[PDB]
Amino acid sequence: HWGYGKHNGPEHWHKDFPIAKGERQSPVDIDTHTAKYDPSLKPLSVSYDQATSLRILNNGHAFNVEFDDSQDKAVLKGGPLDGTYRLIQFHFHWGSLDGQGSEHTVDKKKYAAELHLVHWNTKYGDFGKAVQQPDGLAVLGIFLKVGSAKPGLQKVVDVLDSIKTKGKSADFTNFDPRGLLPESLDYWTYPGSLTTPPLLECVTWIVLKEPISVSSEQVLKFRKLNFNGEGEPEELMVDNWRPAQPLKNRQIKASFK
């Protein structure tokens, strides 16, 4: 099946998922000088005060912290979005080294990791239906650089021991995603796709300009996870990022000057 190895990685995905070579694939390189300030972009509205996390899962390629999305409890609105998008889960993409790991790049610069908070458009009823729509998802991406520790990320780091391998999950209630946000909500936005198969072109990407800092110990813990299932040869979960794709006929807009 697909993965991030030499034999099933990003360069192989198009065989099972031809949309991999589509017109609006993600991630992309964000050329800061070419992105255009768009005064008509409304401020982003992140309302996570009532967020209800439920569980954390190692799915074989990343770990997802899942939320109750059966009601508007944690939503993203405003910015380039029309309507309300509900948070369903968040996960990360990281590298084997601090010099790589992010999916989006800024003027070709790669960050140590990238957090994706996935939200779906409530006008579509459920996530499964939303991904079949061009404006079905809104994914908030936040770059991670190594430096000082991120206090709000520690609870996630500490539970990873319990979901070391593919298929393992653990209760993960009362986690506050507001603790993973940088100070500024300035962002770049463009129409794109999921960065993992099925690579559906249903995402409005909102990538924050300001990265958050995590400690070397925190990211090191990410790199101890396994792509493999328990009782299988150990393959460390590292470099689970897709490289930048052709921008093609798209313009990246900036919410700031």
Ligand SMILES: Cc1ncc([N+](=O)[O-])n1CCNS(N)(=O)=O
């Ligand atoms: C939203 C979604 N559908 C399928 C998967 N998956 O297979 O992991 N994801 C999560 C990773 N996709 S992403 N990077 O574009 O947010």
Ligand SMILES: [Zn+2]
């Ligand atoms: Zn992702």
